[PDB]
Amino acid sequence: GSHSLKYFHTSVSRPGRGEPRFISVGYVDDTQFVRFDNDAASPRMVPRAPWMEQEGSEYWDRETRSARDTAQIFRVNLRTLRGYYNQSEAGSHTLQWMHGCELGPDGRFLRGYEQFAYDGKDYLTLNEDLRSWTAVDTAAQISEQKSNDASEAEHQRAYLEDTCVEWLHKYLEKGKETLLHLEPPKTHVTHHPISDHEATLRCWALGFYPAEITLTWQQDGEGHTQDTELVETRPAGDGTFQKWAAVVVPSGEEQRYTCHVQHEGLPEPVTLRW
Amino acid sequence: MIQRTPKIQVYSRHPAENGKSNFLNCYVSGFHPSDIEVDLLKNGERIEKVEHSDLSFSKDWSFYLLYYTEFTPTEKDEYACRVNHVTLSQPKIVKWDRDM
Amino acid sequence: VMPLSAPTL
């Protein structure tokens, strides 16, 4: 299907506790493959997936340089932004940067995005044309103007349309044995009485990759039961995902409920019952 | 300005079988700011050496982390996750329930 | 790989 190469960068000021903490993580689809963290002596970009272990010094040297340079620029950005918003040196503040390229099923560029947040809210966004920006307020308007001065959209357009796509293809080849492997969920139902009158039915999906899944309970073979208890899809810790959904039902009425699981790894949707 | 409270899930990598090796996970998500402390507890006592994922965030800017340690579950041992975040009145303890 | 340019705000 579609594939994506994305990074998530965070810089947090730590007033009187050292310089800002900076962390970068890169993903292909739902798989982390690199990280950089400056909370350490001589910090380097390092592999975080087995298939990246083979990369040589050319790669690690260039990616460490980029991450170190970004950390420095983010450090300066944090000071500037305090300036724009008339904030003292006393509080801690956050700058986030996310970006990515997305290939469609036909294996070519479909979309690229880039966005900045300050203190957990949108600040500056690259527009869909990848040639202009949207600023949330008068402070971000200055950053917009600096970007226009510096032809920053051109730099980011070249990364998103060209470099990001070239490397996404490389990574998909390097890691194909796992990245292109659909792992379907192992599913089961649990059943626990709550009272004389009611019981919990819980539908589990375990061990699946990628993360995208739909888990629903249906009553009487149409629709979805209201007030289904869902949990956010969570990592197993081994590169696969887990999710469950639960309903509370009247005792003796369990046969009216079906759990429905859709996942790219399943030949067809799975239906479970108690 | 914006602070968001962590969502906390405590769970095993594999369905728990007493006496069999496993991983205990504490997944915290949906939070801001990123400063957070997450401790895994065994019978009320902090496990000194646990690992965590690299700080990342979702489309809405909120952060998520996985904390995890190797463990062998038993009937008698209680496990929990303790989360320290500026949004909480006091550190929040979430017990491990092998059915959740 | 990550971008070779990091925007100045």
Author numbering:
A (entry chain A): 1 to 274
B (entry chain B): 1 to 100
C (entry chain P): 1 to 9
Publication text:
The primary function of HLA-E has been ascribed to presenting self-peptides to NK cells. We have previously demonstrated that the non-structural protein 13 (Nsp13) of SARS-CoV-2 contains the HLA-E-restricted Nsp13232-240 epitope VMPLSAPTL, which hinders binding of HLA-E/peptide complexes to the inhibitory NK cell receptor NKG2A. The Nsp13232-240 epitope is presented by HLA-E and position 2 serves as a main anchor for HLA-E-restricted peptides.
This absence of binding reduces inhibition, rendering target cells that present the viral peptide susceptible to attack by NKG2A+ NK cells. Consequently, excessive presentation of the Nsp13232-240 epitope without binding the NKG2A receptor reduces inhibition and facilitates activation, thereby rendering infected cells susceptible to attack by NK cells. Comparison of these high-resolution structures demonstrated that the conformations of the two epitopes were largely conserved. Surveying genomes of wildlife sarbecoviruses sampled over a period of 17 years, we found that 14 out of 15 viruses encode for the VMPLSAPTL epitope that is identical to the ancestral SARS-CoV-2 epitope. SARS-CoV-1, which caused an outbreak in humans between 2002 and 2004, is another virus closely related to SARS-CoV-2 and likewise encoded the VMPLSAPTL sequence.
